[PDB]
Write a protein that binds this DNA or RNA. Structure first.
Ligand SMILES: Nc1nc2cc[nH]c2c(=O)[nH]1
Lengths: 324, 381
RNA sequence: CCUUCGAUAGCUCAGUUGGUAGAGCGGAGGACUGUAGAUCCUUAGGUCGCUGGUUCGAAUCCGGCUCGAAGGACCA
């Protein structure tokens, strides 16, 4: 398995270049949301040396994800001619040609194919979705080879088969024929027992030579059960949600608490008691409590850094446990 | 007798500019220096490490807001101000409360001191000169503020303001308990006329306080009369004690006041470069990939471009605000270092011209007040 | 072919119940000059997917198509 560093316009949200570099456990791959790279598309249409130099970090690998994990899916908006990526760009009829132009301007290492199948959020519609998604993947594969510079990029496949698990199996079977560099699961945005069973059935057929991607799943329990099913790569929008509403993570891997209460003004210990995390060394929880009462941005920065460090450490620990 | 904390090694031949050092138990300051306001710099996004990386050695704080929350008792129990913001360098505390609103938004000053209002009835705290010195000793800053009637304000209101300022200075001197460890800076307030200010200089020079300051200037008068008052105050005061100035930070203002003989100087989205102050919100150069300043040592210009920051200006608001604020503070520090260097080996009367040549390019576009001040001090463009 | 929902500032959504558009989040001009009386003021940026009808006036009422999500497979 693995993890993708959640990036808000190159860097982490509420994180600058130096502050992000100060974060430990940073993976070598940065997940750029295609939902927030439209104005960047017009800017990079003539920048002509990639987005890695544009953001200042050219040495890292880039993944162009469509759905922002914070806002990953409705009851249904995604079709197989455009994808209403929830974010900061790419809403106005982002057709196949628009996707090609955006990925030519950005030049991502791996670019994600457009999703489909909003049923998981019975047979006839499922079969239509399967055939349409296969046609879209074929069109993207055909258009990817038309540009020599674009040929360095990698397509990521998608699996969508309506409601009936048999049609999802047939979608996975027929999509796995194409030589895609990855696989995606849509409609499992978080998950329940029925969706868990559908995910297990879908993943029971996909070949192991390509990675598996899921969207909308970041909670520790949902992530754990999806890994148990066989999903490899995950998103990291949970710390952003926890920090946005003035809350600090508390679950130990080796929920959230709201600090807007008067009970934390007497404790001199940090948010974590005697551990080796960043919060155990930066300040004390009374400082964050005061800064939250005064509504100071430095509290947000510290909470964001601590949440990201804890989440990345959790992913590193689970990956080490699974590998060993 | 208060010890003299300033030693002089360089002074301009054609002007009144000086270069010196101030010794404090927590650090050493190089005058002239610019102290950024600590509360603003902290809330704009900059962490302690990022601000310290630029090389700043002096910070500013307000004691009134710390008294409002979480309370003097709690801040005293844990020795708050030192280990709270994690600032390792010297910090200057301010009494606060007496903003430009004066009595229009603040309670009338009683005999004991000044009373503040808060949304909660029990959140109010007493601010007496004895209470002020006690809470500032609790803070433990190297420079201790003294309670003063800071005004924005004409008529005899300033007359009784300076009377009560002298009375509270005497009370603070009588109530101060560690003169050696902490230094107190007096404040000179006389409104708009100079004769009562001359008298104020008289009594605060009769008292041997370890520091001096001037206030009530910015936001009420033009720059010409401001620099004239600063020049007369600096000429009156001796050279063995530091001089503090408020309402400053602009490049031209700071350079002119340095030439006059000053020593101390006090929501992002704009940047400061040698050509001047330019808003990064501008879309005229949102496409150009060149850095904001090729020669600026700040990480923002040397690592990131104008186009990327323009795309990130609100995309990640905290990141952009942090970058802009750290770039501005780095520019201010670099300007102060360049001015001090020009002072050290005696190029200032020429270099100042180049300074305006950095922005304007000729003496014609220079501000009239700056030209008058330079001509009076002995530097002709 | 058939049935139910869905398309609005860079973008999630309120408005969708007829008053030419707002908030969160993007982004515009300017102020950082002793910030907790709340990161502030000014304000750039929307042919509301397309077409057509209704009305003094349509993001809104009404039909369908291009692109559709969801149901029975134009065919299985
Ligand atoms: N340190 C200090 N700053 C300011 C800013 C306005 N007035 C004053 C003052 O009296 N003292």
């Amino acid at each position: 398995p693995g993890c993708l560093l959640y990036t808000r316009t190159g860097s982490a949200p509420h994180l600058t270049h130096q502050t992000l570099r100060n974060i430990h456990g940073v993976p070598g791959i940065a997940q750029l949301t295609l939902s927030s790279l439209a104005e960047h598309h017009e800017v990079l249409a003539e920048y002509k040396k990639g987005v890695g130099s544009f953001i200042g970090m050219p040495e890292s690998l880039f993944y162009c994800s469509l759905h922002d994990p914070v806002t990953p899916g409705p009851a249904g908006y995604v079709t197989s001619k455009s994808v209403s990526v929830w974010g900061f760009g790419g809403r106005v009829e982002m057709t196949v040609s628009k996707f090609m132009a955006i990925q030519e301007a950005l030049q991502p290492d791996w670019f994600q194919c457009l999703s489909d199948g909003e049923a998981s959020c019975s047979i006839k519609r499922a079969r239509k979705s399967v055939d349409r998604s296969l046609l879209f993947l074929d069109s993207c594969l055909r258009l990817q080879e038309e540009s020599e510079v674009l040929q360095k990029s990698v397509i990521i496949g998608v699996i969508e088969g309506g409601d009936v698990m048999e049609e999802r199996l047939r979608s996975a079977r027929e999509t796995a024929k194409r030589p895609v560099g990855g696989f995606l699961l849509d409609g499992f945005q978080g998950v329940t027992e029925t969706r868990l069973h559908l995910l297990s059935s879908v993943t029971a057929e996909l070949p192991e030579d390509k990675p598996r991607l899921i969207c909308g799943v970041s909670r520790p329990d949902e992530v754990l059960e999806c890994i148990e099913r066989g999903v490899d790569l995950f998103e990291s929008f949970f710390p952003y949600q926890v920090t946005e509403r003035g809350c600090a993570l508390t679950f130990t891997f080796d929920f959230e608490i709201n600090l807007k209460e008067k009970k934390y003004q007497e404790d001199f210990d940090p948010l974590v008691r005697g551990c080796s995390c960043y919060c155990c060394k930066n300040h004390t929880r009374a400082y964050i409590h005061h800064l939250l009462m005064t509504n100071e941005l430095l509290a947000g920065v510290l909470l964001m850094m601590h949440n990201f460090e804890h989440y990345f450490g959790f992913f590193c620990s689970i990956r080490e446990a699974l590998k060993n | 007798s208060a010890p003299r904390i300033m030693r002089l090694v360089a002074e301009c031949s054609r002007s009144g500019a000086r270069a010196g050092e101030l010794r404090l138990p927590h650090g050493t300051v190089a005058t002239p220096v610019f102290m950024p306001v600590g509360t603003q710099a902290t809330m704009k996004g900059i962490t302690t490490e990022q601000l310290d990386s630029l090389g700043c050695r002096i910070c500013l704080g307000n004691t009134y807001h710390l008294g409002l929350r979480p309370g003097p008792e709690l801040i005293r129990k844990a020795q708050g101000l030192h280990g709270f913001m994690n600032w390792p360098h010297n910090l200057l505390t301010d009494s606060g409360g007496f903003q430009m609103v004066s009595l229009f938004s603040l309670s009338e000053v009683t005999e004991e001191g000044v009373h503040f209002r808060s949304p909660y009835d029990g959140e109010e705290t007493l601010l007496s000169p004895e209470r002020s010195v006690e809470i500032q000793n609790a803070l433990g800053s190297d420079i201790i503020m003294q309670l003063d009637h800071v005004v924005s304000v004409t008529g005899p209101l300033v007359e009784e303001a300076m009377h009560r300022s002298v009375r509270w200075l005497d009370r603070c001197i009588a109530a101060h308990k560690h003169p050696d460890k902490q230094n107190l800076f007096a404040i000179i307030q006389g409104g708009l006329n100079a004769d009562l200010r001359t008298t104020c200089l008289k009594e605060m020079t009769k008292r041997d306080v370890p520091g001096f300051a001037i206030g009530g200037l910015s936001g009420g008068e033009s720059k010409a009369q401001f620099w004239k008052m600063v020049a007369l105050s600096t000429s009156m005061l001796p050279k063995d004690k530091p001089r503090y100035l408020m309402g400053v930070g602009y490049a031209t203002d700071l350079v002119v006041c340095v030439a006059l003989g000053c020593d101390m100087f006090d929501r992002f989205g704009s940047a400061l470069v040698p050509t001047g102050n330019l808003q990064l919100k501008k879309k005229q150069y949102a496409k150009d990939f060149s850095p904001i300043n090729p020669e600026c040592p700040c990480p923002t210009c040397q690592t990131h471009s104008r186009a990327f920051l323009h795309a990130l200006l609100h995309s990640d608001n905290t990141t952009a605000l942090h970058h802009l604020t750290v770039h501005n503070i780095a520019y201010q520090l670099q300007l102060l270092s360049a001015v001090r260097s020009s002072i050290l080996e005696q190029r200032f009367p020429d270099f100042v011209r180049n300074f305006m040549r950095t922005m304007y390019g000729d003496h014609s576009l220079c501000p009239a007040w700056a030209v008058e001040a330079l001509a009076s001090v002995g530097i002709m463009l």
